[PDB]
């Protein structure tokens, strides 16, 4: 019976996803959300396939960079665990709040 | 002895309408003048781009309106849009 310690697979994952460039959110659920949010602005919209892709690329680049700032915020408080207050601090300082 | 335009007098007219007994310092007026030019440049710019994106050589009140919706937050956009429509509608019947 075999067991890797907590954080061991995490590091393995960091290295894996930092090596690659594929999108990390499944496309369909992302698309539905996009259309839902769009429905509040105008009804009966269609979307170029590439348009959703653009939004996904943009949204994933944004969240990945936010997690970097979030992680610096956590580490600044001498933790290794990211918490909502880390996200909050990052966004407040980025000028998004 | 070159001439330098500002929006000062128009800012002053509007001030009298909303607070008939309140004055404005020359520094506050300078800031008001900077704010009007600033917003002007920001709307005209959006308008400029928007036209270019759509292969239009003409900036119309319609480009201005989209620019206003891109540029102003929520409730200011709503009101600016009514104020602008109203002036253009009124303007159209008045010649």
């Amino acid at each position: 019976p075999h067991r890797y310690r907590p954080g061991t697979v995490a590091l393995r994952e960091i290295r894996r996803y930092q090596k690659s460039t594929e999108l990390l959110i499944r496309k369909l659920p992302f698309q539905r959300l996009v259309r839902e949010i769009a429905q509040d602005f105008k009804t009966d919209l269609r979307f170029q396939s590439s348009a959703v892709m653009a939004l996904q690329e943009a949204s994933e680049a944004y969240l990945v960079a936010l997690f970097e700032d979030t992680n610096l915020c956590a580490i600044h408080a001498k933790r290794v665990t990211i918490m909502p207050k880390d996200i909050q601090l990052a966004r407040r300082i980025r000028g998004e709040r | 002895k070159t001439r330098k335009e500002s929006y000062a007098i128009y800012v002053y007219k509007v001030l009298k309408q909303v607070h008939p007994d309140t004055g404005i310092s020359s520094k506050a007026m300078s800031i008001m003048n900077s704010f009007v030019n600033d917003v002007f440049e920001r709307i005209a710019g959006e308008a400029s781009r928007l036209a270019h994106y759509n292969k239009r050589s003409t900036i119309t009140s319609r480009e201005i309106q989209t620019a206003v919706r891109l540029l102003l937050p929520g409730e200011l956009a709503k009101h600016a849009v009514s104020e602008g429509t109203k002036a253009v509608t009124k303007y159209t019947s008045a010649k």
Binding site: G95 | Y7, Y10, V11, K13, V14, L15, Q17, V18, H19, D21, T22, G23, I24, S25, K27, A28, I31, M32, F35, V36, D38, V39, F40, I43, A44, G45, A47, S48, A51, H52, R56, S57, T58, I59, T60, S61, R62, E63, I64, V68, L71, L72, P73, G74, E75, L76, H79, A80, E83, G84, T85, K86, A87, V88, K90, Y91, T92, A94, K95
Partner: protein, 106 residues
């Protein structure tokens, strides 16, 4: 001869705004409605800030609007604040704000 301002029922100079759009190199052509709509947005916006700033001046028992009043007016208003989110009002200072944990006792 009625000014194009009065035709649209505006204090702001429609003539001026039309001219500035041309000299401004924004497009080949300016539509006749454009300076009208723009001048009214401009007037609206300046009415909004003068209203608010006027109130700050009165709240302070002052008769004259100074840069401090414009700053209070802009920063106390969610929408103006965001519209001028990347702007500095000289001689405006900041909003009184002290973080909880800095206060004495408990």
């Amino acid at each position: 001869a009625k000014t194009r301002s009065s035709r649209a029922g505006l204090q702001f100079p429609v003539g001026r705004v039309h001219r500035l759009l041309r000299k401004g190199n924004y497009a080949e052509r300016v539509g006749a409605g454009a300076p009208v709509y723009l001048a009214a947005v401009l007037e609206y916006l300046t009415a909004e800030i003068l209203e608010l700033a006027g109130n700050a001046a009165r709240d302070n028992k002052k008769t004259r609007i100074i840069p401090r009043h414009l700053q209070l007016a802009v920063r106390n208003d969610e929408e103006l604040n965001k519209l001028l989110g990347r702007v500095t009002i000289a001689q405006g200072g900041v909003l009184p704000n002290i973080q909880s944990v800095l206060l004495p006792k408990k």
